[PDB]
Amino acid sequence: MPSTFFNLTMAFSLSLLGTLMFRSHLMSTLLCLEGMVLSLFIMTSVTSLNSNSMSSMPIPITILVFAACEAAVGLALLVKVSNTYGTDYVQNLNLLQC
Amino acid sequence: MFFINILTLLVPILIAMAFLTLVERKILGYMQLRKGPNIVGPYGILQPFADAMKLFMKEPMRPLTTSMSLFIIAPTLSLTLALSLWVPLPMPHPLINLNLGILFILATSSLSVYSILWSGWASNSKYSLFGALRAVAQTISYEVTMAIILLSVLLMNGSYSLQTLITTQEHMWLLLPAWPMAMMWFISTLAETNRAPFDLTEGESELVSGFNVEYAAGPFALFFMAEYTNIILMNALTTIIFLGPLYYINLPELYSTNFMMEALLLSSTFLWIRASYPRFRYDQLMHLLWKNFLPLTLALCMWHISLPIFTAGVPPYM
Amino acid sequence: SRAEYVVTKLDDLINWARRSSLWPMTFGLACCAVEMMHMAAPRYDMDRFGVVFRASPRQADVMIVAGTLTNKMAPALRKVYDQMPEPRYVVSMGSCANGGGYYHYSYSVVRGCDRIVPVDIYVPGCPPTAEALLYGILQLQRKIKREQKLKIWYRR
Amino acid sequence: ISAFLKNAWAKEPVLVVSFSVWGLAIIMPMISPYTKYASMINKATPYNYPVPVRDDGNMPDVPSHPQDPLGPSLDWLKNL
Amino acid sequence: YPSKETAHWKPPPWNDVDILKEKAVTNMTLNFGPQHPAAHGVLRLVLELSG
Amino acid sequence: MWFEILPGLAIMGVCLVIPGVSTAYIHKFTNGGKEKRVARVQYQWYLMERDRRISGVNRYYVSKGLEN
Amino acid sequence: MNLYTVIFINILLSLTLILVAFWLPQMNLYSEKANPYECGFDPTSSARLPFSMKFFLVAITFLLFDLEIALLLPLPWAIQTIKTSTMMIMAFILVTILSLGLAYEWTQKGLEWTE
Amino acid sequence: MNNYIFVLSSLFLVGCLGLALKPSPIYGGLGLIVSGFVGCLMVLGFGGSFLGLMVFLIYLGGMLVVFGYTTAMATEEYPETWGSNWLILGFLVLGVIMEVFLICVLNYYDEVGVINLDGLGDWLMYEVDDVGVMLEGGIGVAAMYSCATWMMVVAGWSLFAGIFIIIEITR
Amino acid sequence: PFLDIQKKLGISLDRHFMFLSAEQPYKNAARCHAFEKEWIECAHGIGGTRAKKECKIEFDDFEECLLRYKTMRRMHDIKKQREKLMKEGKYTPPPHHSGREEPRP
Ligand SMILES: C/C=C(\C)[C@H](O)[C@H](C)/C=C(C)/C=C\C/C(C)=C/Cc1[nH]c(OC)c(OC)c(=O)c1C
Ligand code: SF4
Structure with a gap:
């Protein structure tokens, strides 16, 4: 349990490192966000099953709900980005500095 | 002895697949005013083995x-x-007694999609990718209805265990309470498995054998027998859920036999349905299975939530 | 008993498999394909013999050149024959494909599919009766039945 | 509007069934008398131990034994 | 304040709508070829696809 | 004719009947004249672990009775 | 471990089968048979290019409806509670809300495809 | 089978690491799927079936849409696998090695308290109720319909309003 | 909270499943129920700065129940000494820990 919680926190940190350190595409960033969601889910679920706190077990479903809504609007923004520029790259989004 | 049990569950299912291929060809033949295979064996009971070996x-x-x-x-x-x-699968006593069998089935099938959807991408070609995207559309169409149908049906069973449906159906079938859910479940099992009229991924006249155009041998054979195994699985699910056969604790082989028949x-x-109808369009499938099946599905879910209560028919938790 | 006899019977088995299940291609160019359809039709049913079509050339064991082969359609034929995975066989069907046919002396016709694909069996007619194409298919079966591959491998 | 529903039962009868069944699901719980026995049956199920109680000396209505007259007679669940 | 780096910087538009090289319409192309069983015999049928 | 389909159907049916009767009889053979126990909740698992530790042999399916 | 065993057995069946399919037969490889099909002729471009999807809004709302399934699915356990009125009202509200969203999308032509 | 959970956690770490290296969204979605599978398996190992099954289902249905999108938008001629970049391959190997060295390090500076290689599998479940019924995960989630009905309404509003948000962003 | 609208109206939208000893769906105790109850009943009326040092024993017992670090240390020490002794040949494990006991019921 402490082992797997350490590992899950390191996994969160890896996915956070990922979504911070960008590459060309944006879809990969959204996937890193989904991975952070998933690690947080598993942490919450394991704490709830360990402590036998069945009152908090409605929390991870809420996490999944709101994370999926987040993914939805991100993907809609991606649709708009492609309709504008055509190729998903995050380097073409460099005209607000001026 | 568990390994012998694995054998008795796995090898007969493969022979069943192999002879379902024969039965398909011959039934479609006789519907088409011809005799299917009757040469390679006495009545063509070796054509599946020939096909496998040749592949x-x-x-x-x-x-x-x-x-x-x-x-x-x-594959x-x-x-x-x-x-x-x-x-x-309880036939009647299963190999693996799970408490959330239907969720296992659902997740396993939603993952089975990814075979099509990665083989199509990996096989770098056009018709391959067409088949993949059509699979995406198909799953988008059917998964919601499958889940909410199955929820509404088990909302009078009381659990996700498959074995409890046998006692739920000790004196009746779930087809008379839920024939509409049964209709929609049947047609969603028809959309699942990529079976006509909802084929739309190896649609030989629209696509030139989508997601298999680049597969030739035993890989293609694996896809083939996977399809023809999921067919029997879904029929087994329909007949365990709605067409509940007789358990008779002393006579369980009776359950197995009636299960076989159904x-x-x-x-x-x-x-039959493959032989009779033409193919849908993969946007017409969406329009159907969102604008006709999902309204009625949600309405009947509301109904089946109300029904245990206003009839005092709340089932038991084990 | 003997390794050579065992090899002979094994080869008989593999030939039986490839012979009782040879999957042609939906590749028909001209009138002769109509008689191919008629062979697929009830009277002379092909699936009776384990001969059902497949649209992709990679899920196919044989190609039947049922029509006239032109200079514009020959690269496609050869691409398709190439893409077919070996073991593979060819049936030239009709005078227009055996030889040049009724269009032998024309500017846009290859005077036989012999020049583009290697043919195993020739079926004559304009058109060949589906009865006759069926005879030729069973003759190709008989040809596969006497391949003697593992025999010669043992004798290498 | 009767004519409108007459038209909709021919064209688009799937949504008519849907709205009908929705309203029926909402209205029928209000109607039945059996609607109230559901909570009572869910309550009757003893998933957890009925923990005994100390005899203060002022517990008349509480029974001294399982099969005494007092307590909730579950015979309404029988022959419902 | 004109830096070396902000020298090429241009002032934005007044309606917040920049003029762009509108991306080329790179439709996908497909040979609905002769071997295709729906091609009634021999029919190349190059066709462009936006999906 | 249409009765020439019944052979394949018969093989198919004999093959679909075996996975059930086979599982039932294997269960009865290992566990011993008894259906294989379902343990859907921890209470049933407790009962089975108990019956294991009662046996004298680590097998939950000996069913010691009123000889004790 | 029974289930792990069944799955390993199926895995090894599939892998042994592919091993046989690859190392049993004969091979005659060359570039003209290993290049993509495209019906006799050659492709005019790559297949790793944009395929415009014209049902993306339908995909996203499928995701949200999947979450709705995830919320509806605890009902078989929610029914053995003592209340049986709060759950009724709340499930009614959830399903009705989902139907309202479906109706708005339908009327606004979100279920139609982007021609 | 005592190192089961540690192996599952390490596999999940590797899945999320290969995710964070960001190949094309195809292999990223493959990583999400494998990692959700592993997550389900450990949630079961800790005594939870429903939550794992639902992570699996949700993430599968999501990566389906990700495939449908990335074929349209996040596609290139050469989708850049993990092996495509010597640098990415090097950082992946280095990340595995670095986490292994880190585990072997923190198993030294603290005998136990963060990680226990010695006693592994001995601390997982923490006071199970050896006699019980109506105790699984699913009762706690079904409390969304009773005793936690604000989570249900707030989630439902998120979904409902998300539909409108989708339509408006896309219009 | 910031705007105590719940306390204003007496409702509990979220302030009744704030911790472990709080109304599990059927009356199944979460682990450390007693410890958390005792910590909370000490830290009532008091606020913060005074509870953090007048209710420290009870929080420390709770922290040991939930995270459970000192028992790990204790068992790890016992195991390490046992392995050392068995390697030296000093300890001889009994039947009721090698896998051969008389089961009690
Ligand atoms: C279960 C069995 C199947 C699905 C088989 O695929 C079917 C039964 C067999 C067929 C279709 C046979 C031959 C293939 C072919 C591509 C012919 C060329 C052709 N095709 C035409 O129309 C379709 C024509 O129209 C006037 C033609 O002139 C020409 C020249
Ligand atoms: S040989 Fe005769 S029937 Fe055949 S394609 Fe030529 S003209 Fe037509």
């Missing part, structure tokens, strides 16, 4: 544009899931 002697195709990893791994996954789906009937019905 495993052909040279496999490793193209140049392909992604070989996903290419080889997708593996396909058959593995098709063959793990038979695991919790599963054969429903599989022959799949073949």
Whole structure:
């Protein structure tokens, strides 16, 4: 349990490192966000099953709900980005500095 | 002895697949005013073995544009899931007694999609990708209705365990309470498995054998037998859920026999349906299965939530 | 008993498999394909013999050149024959494909599919009766039945 | 509007069934008398131990034994 | 304040709508070829696809 | 004719009947004249672990009675 | 471990089968048979290019409806509670809300495809 | 089978690491799927079936849409696998090695308290109720319909309003 | 909270499943129920700065129940000494820990 919680926190940190350190595409960033969601889910679920706190077990479903809504609007923004520029790259989004 | 049990569950299912191929060809023949295979065996009871052997002697195709990893791994996954789906099936006593069998089935099938969807991408070509995207659309169409149908049906059973449906159906079938859910479940099992009229991924006249155009040998054979195994699985599910056979604790082989009868009937019905109708369009499928099936599905879910209460028919938790 | 006899019977088995299940291609160019359809039709049913079509050339064991082969359609034929995975066989069907046919002396016709694909069996007619194409298919079966491959491998 | 529903039962009868069944699901719980026995049956199920109680000496209505007259007679669940 | 780096910087538009090289319409192309069983015999039928 | 389909259907049916009767009889053979126990909740698992530790042999399916 | 065993057995069946399919037959490889099909002729471009999807809004709302399934699915356990009125009202509200969203999308032509 | 959970956690770490290296969204979605599978398996190992099954289902249905999108938008001629970049391959190997060295390090500076290689599998479940019924995960989630009905309404509003948000962003 | 609208109206939208000893769906105790109850009943009326040092024993017992670090240390020490002794040949494990006991019921 402490082992797997350490590992899950390191996994969160890896996915956070990922979504911070960008590459060309944006879809990969959204996937890193989904991975952070998933690690947080598993942490919450394991704490709830360990402590036998069945009152908090409605929390991870809420996490999944709101994370999926987040993914939805991100993907809609991606649709708009492609309709504008055509190729998903995050380097073409460099005209607000001026 | 568990391994002998694995044998008695796995090898007869494969012979059943192999002879379902024969039955398909012959039934479609006689509906088409012809006799199917009657040459290679007495009445053609060796054509499946011939097809398998010939497919495993052909040279496999490793193209140049392909992604070989996903290419080889997708049929593996396909058959593995098709063959793990038979695991919790109570016929009547299952091999693996799970408490959430239907969720296992649902997740396993939603993962079975990825065989098509990665083989199509890995096989770098056009019709391949068309088949993949059509699979995406198909799953988008059917998954919601499958889940909410199954929820509404088990909302009078009381659990996700498959074995409790046998006691839920000790004196009746769930077809008379839920024939509409049964209709929609049947047609969603028809949209699942990529079976006509909802084929739309190996649609030989629209696409030139989508998601298999670059597969030749035993890989293609694996996809084939995965499809023809999922057919029997879904018929087994329909007849465990709605067409509940007789348990009779002293006579369990009676349950197994009536299960066999009903599963054969429903599989022959799949073949019948292939022979009778033309193909849908993969946007018309969306329009159908969102604008006709999902309204009625949600309405009947409301109904089946109300019904345990205003009838005092709340089932038991074990 | 003997390794050579065992090899002979094994080869008989593999030939039986490839012979009782040879999957042609939906590749028909001209009138002769109509008689191919008629062979697929009830009277002379092909699936009776384990001969059902497949649209992709990679899920196919044989191609039947049922029509006239032109200079514009020959690269496609050869691409398709190439893409077919070995073991593979060819049936030239009709005078227009055996030889040049009724269009032998024209500017846009290849005077036989012999020049582009290697043919195993020739079926004559304009058109060949589906009865006759069926005879030729069973003759190709008989040809596969006497392949003697593993025999010669043992004798290498 | 009767004519409108007459038209909709021919064209688009799937949504008519849907709205009908929705309203029926909402209205029928209000109607039945059996609607109230559901909570009572869910309550009757003893998933957890009925923990005994100390005899203060002022517990008349509480029974001294399982099969005494007092307590909730579950015979309404029988012959419902 | 004109830096070396902000020298090429141009002032934005007044309606917040920049003029762009509108991306080329790179439709996908497909040979609905002769071997295709729906091609009634021999029919190349190059066709462009936006999906 | 249509009765020439019944052979394949018969093989198919004999093959679909075996996975059930086979599982039932294997269960009865290993566990011993008894259906294989379902343990859906921890209470049933407790009962089975108990019956294991009662036996004298680590097998939950000996069913010691009123000889004790 | 029974289930792990069944799945490993199926896995190894599939892999042994692929091994046989690859190392049993004969091979005659060359570039003209290993290149993509495209019906006799050659492709005019790559297949790793944009395929415009015209049902993306339908995909996203499928995701949200999947979450709705995830919320509806605890009902078999929610029914053995003592209340049986709060759950009724709340499930009614959830399903009705989902139907309202479906109706708005339908009327606004979100279920139609982007021609 | 005592190192089961540690192996599952390490596999999940590797899945999320290969995710964070960001190949094309195809292999990223493959990583999400494998990692959700592993997550389900450990949630079961800790005594939870429903939550794992639902992670699996949700993430599968999501990566389906990700495939449908990335074929349209996040596609290139050469999708850049993990092996495509020597640098990415090097950082992946280095990340595995670095986490292994880190585990072997923190198993030294603290005998136990963060990680226990010695006693592994001995601390997982923490006071199970050896006699019980109506105790699984699913009762706690079904409390969304009773005793936690604000989570249900707030989630439902998120979904409902998300539909409108989708339509408006896309219009 | 910031705007105590719940306390204003007496409702509990979220302030009744704030911790472990709080109304599990059927009356199944979460682990450390007693410890958390005792910590909370000490830290009532008091706020913060005074509870953090007048209710420290009870929080420390709770922290040991939930995270459970000192028992790990204790068992790890016992195991390490046992392995050392068994390697030296000093300890001889009994039947009721090698896998051969008389089961009690
Ligand atoms: C279960 C069995 C199946 C699905 C088989 O695929 C079917 C029964 C067999 C067929 C279709 C046979 C031959 C293939 C072919 C591509 C012919 C060329 C052709 N095709 C035409 O129309 C379709 C024509 O129209 C006037 C033609 O002139 C020409 C020249
Ligand atoms: S040989 Fe005769 S029937 Fe055949 S394609 Fe030529 S003209 Fe037509």
